[PDB]
Scaffold this active site. Structure first.
Site, PDB file in Angstrom:
ATOM      1  N   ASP A  66      25.475  41.921  83.610  1.00 38.67           N
ATOM      2  CA  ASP A  66      26.747  42.371  82.529  1.00 38.67           C
ATOM      3  C   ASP A  66      26.335  42.302  81.130  1.00 38.67           C
ATOM      4  O   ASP A  66      26.936  42.880  80.700  1.00 38.67           O
ATOM      5  CB  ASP A  66      27.785  42.577  83.850  1.00 38.67           C
ATOM      6  CG  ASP A  66      27.665  41.306  84.184  1.00 38.67           C
ATOM      7  OD1 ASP A  66      26.642  39.899  84.281  1.00 38.67           O
ATOM      8  OD2 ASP A  66      29.246  40.883  85.222  1.00 38.67           O
ATOM      9  N   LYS A 114      28.793  34.436  93.080  1.00 37.54           N
ATOM     10  CA  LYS A 114      30.337  35.357  93.838  1.00 37.54           C
ATOM     11  C   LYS A 114      30.635  36.234  95.083  1.00 37.54           C
ATOM     12  O   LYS A 114      31.423  36.845  95.493  1.00 37.54           O
ATOM     13  CB  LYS A 114      30.854  37.045  92.248  1.00 37.54           C
ATOM     14  CG  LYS A 114      30.639  35.671  90.772  1.00 37.54           C
ATOM     15  CD  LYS A 114      30.605  37.618  89.874  1.00 37.54           C
ATOM     16  CE  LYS A 114      28.519  38.140  90.508  1.00 37.54           C
ATOM     17  NZ  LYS A 114      29.052  38.823  88.442  1.00 37.54           N
TER      18      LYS A 114
HETATM   19  O1  GLC Z   1      29.700  39.248  86.741  1.00 35.92           O
HETATM   20  C1  GLC Z   1      29.736  37.806  85.174  1.00 35.92           C
HETATM   21  C2  GLC Z   1      28.452  36.833  85.376  1.00 35.92           C
HETATM   22  O2  GLC Z   1      29.173  36.446  87.044  1.00 35.92           O
HETATM   23  C3  GLC Z   1      28.138  35.114  87.652  1.00 35.92           C
HETATM   24  O3  GLC Z   1      27.985  33.552  87.187  1.00 35.92           O
HETATM   25  C4  GLC Z   1      26.481  35.739  87.531  1.00 35.92           C
HETATM   26  O4  GLC Z   1      25.907  34.569  88.248  1.00 35.92           O
HETATM   27  C5  GLC Z   1      26.767  36.255  86.126  1.00 35.92           C
HETATM   28  O5  GLC Z   1      25.107  36.621  86.705  1.00 35.92           O
HETATM   29  C6  GLC Z   1      27.157  37.538  86.185  1.00 35.92           C
HETATM   30  O6  GLC Z   1      26.872  38.004  84.482  1.00 35.92           O
END
Ligand code: GLC
Ligand code: HKG
EC number: 2.7.1.1
Length: 448
Positions: A195, A159
């Protein structure tokens, strides 16, 4: 004349629809995606194939089998901003969010975790509790290889995070080191959760049938309660353990190649992580608005939008925000919502310009909802099979700005998941109380 203008508008509409039709996915395309994902999920769980799987299926050490009482600190990094929460378990909350500076996200790990530490210090002063040493849960929204609930290495940033000297290192260690370097307060770091996991646990608290957590926000990911016998990476076969799929990385080994459009390749090539998180790049709110922008630029180039001349703002990377996609699709019919967004982007849109923008938004967000549905369907079908149930009744806990705030995503996503999951009764619930409650509930058990 009227009829010349009408012929012009009809021809233009047809050309737009021909371009947007590329975003279509038939039921068989989704089933194909779903089956490939299921195969990757099985591969991620197995000791023999884990290192070669694109879907890592990471053990979380959160279990079905196990609570302490008192005050708990929760942290959240990886969604939007940095969040600090105090939660009392006896659940009652207190909260503060902090905007992360750009150089903290793309500088050094030292810089990022120093900033985190600075934020915790600020929060503790605001509530007259910098003298208190509390059990702490860390919602850390990135792929982590766990050794336990309180120890795990960062596999890679996602991200747009780029902080040097973090990948391959114990994230709990990085946090502890930063707290010590500051020396302003003390905390007992007892748990680190994704998360997805924080969402599942917080939703479980309301509904004990909740055994799936999903995020459709900045990124896209899911976790679920797997049979311990199937979690080969952790010794033991009794009960269940939460598994963090990291399904965002599906396609990173070429599994989605035939479905990728020019817009997807452009988004990927201009991203902080080229060639990575390809499935997530089809869905996530970090990328959705940008996909729309690139579609609009194609339509401009074809002289189908804005007289073939785009504004400086429309030609700016990231300027078509994902929230604009939601706002455009919330338009009641008068085009006012669409006009306002496009006006602030320095455009002078006609009524048909507005209609075309709406169609482009719908095309991207519908594909996102349908692609996402194949992922969740894969998880749910696998769970039904593993649990040997004729009919599975399951609750899925969800968080994220795309899922929560888009006017149509939820509807399209739910309908598609259900089509793709025969003999399943799925209840969807929203994480109304944030990740902090989930992290603290985990901490309350983990601190033992
Ligand atoms: O935040 C939503 C998701 O974003 C990305 O895919 C991260 O790699 C993952 O760990 C997280 O759960
Ligand atoms: C020993 C040790 O260190 N470890 C490492 C850390 C391990 C761990 N820490 S938290 C955890 N799991 C859970 N924590 C909090 C809640 S909220 C809640 C709400 C109401 C009632 C009960 N819970 C629910 C949990 O999971 C359950 C429980 C029952 C059914 N389904 C699920 C998913 N597992 C245990 C082993």
């Amino acid at each position: 004349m009227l009829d010349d203008r009408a012929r012009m508008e009809a021809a233009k509409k047809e050309k737009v629809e021909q371009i947007l039709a590329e975003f279509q996915l038939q039921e068989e395309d989704l089933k194909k995606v779903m089956r490939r994902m299921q195969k990757e999920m099985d591969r991620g769980l197995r000791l023999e194939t884990h290192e070669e799987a694109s879907v890592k299926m990471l053990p979380t050490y959160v279990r079905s089998t196990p609570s302490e009482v008192g005050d708990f600190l929760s942290l959240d990094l990886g969604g939007t901003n940095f969040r600090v929460m105090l939660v009392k378990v006896g659940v009652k909350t207190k909260h503060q969010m902090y905007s992360i500076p750009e150089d903290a996200m793309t500088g050094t790990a030292e810089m990022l975790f120093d900033y985190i530490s600075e934020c915790i210090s600020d929060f503790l002063d605001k509530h007259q509790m910098k003298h208190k040493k509390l059990p702490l849960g860390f919602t850390f929204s990135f792929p982590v290889r766990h050794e336990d609930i309180d120890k795990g290495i960062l596999l890679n940033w996602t991200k747009g995070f780029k902080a040097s000297g973090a990948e391959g290192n114990n994230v709990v260690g990085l946090l502890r080191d930063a707290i010590k370097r500051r020396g302003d307060f003390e905390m007992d770091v007892v748990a680190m959760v994704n998360d997805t996991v924080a969402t599942m646990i917080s939703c479980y608290y309301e509904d004990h049938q909740c055994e799936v957590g999903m995020i459709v926000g900045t990124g896209c990911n899911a976790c679920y309660m797997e049979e311990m016998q199937n979690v080969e990476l952790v010794e033991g076969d009794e009960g269940r353990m939460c598994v963090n799929t990291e399904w965002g990385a599906f396609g990173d080994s070429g599994e989605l190649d035939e479905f990728l459009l020019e817009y997807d390749r452009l988004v990927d090539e201009s991203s902080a992580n080229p060639g990575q998180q390809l499935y997530e790049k089809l869905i996530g709110g970090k990328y959705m608005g940008e996909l729309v922008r690139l579609v609009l630029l194609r339509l401009v180039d074809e002289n189908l939008l804005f007289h073939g001349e785009a504004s400086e703002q429309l030609r700016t990377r990231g300027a078509f925000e994902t929230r604009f996609v939601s706002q455009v699709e919330s338009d009641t019919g008068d085009r006012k919502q669409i006009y306002n967004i496009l006006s602030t982007l320095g455009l002078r849109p006609s009524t048909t310009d507005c209609d075309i923008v709406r169609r482009a938004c719908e095309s991207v967000s519908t594909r996102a909802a349908h692609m996402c549905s194949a992922g969740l369907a894969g998880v749910i079908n696998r769970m039904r099979e593993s649990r040997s149930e004729d009919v599975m009744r399951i609750t899925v806990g969800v968080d994220g700005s795309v899922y929560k705030l888009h006017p149509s995503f939820k509807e399209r996503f739910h309908a598609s998941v259900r089509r793709l999951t025969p003999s399943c009764e799925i209840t969807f619930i929203e994480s109304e109380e944030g990740s902090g409650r989930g992290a603290a509930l985990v901490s309350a058990v983990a601190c033992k």
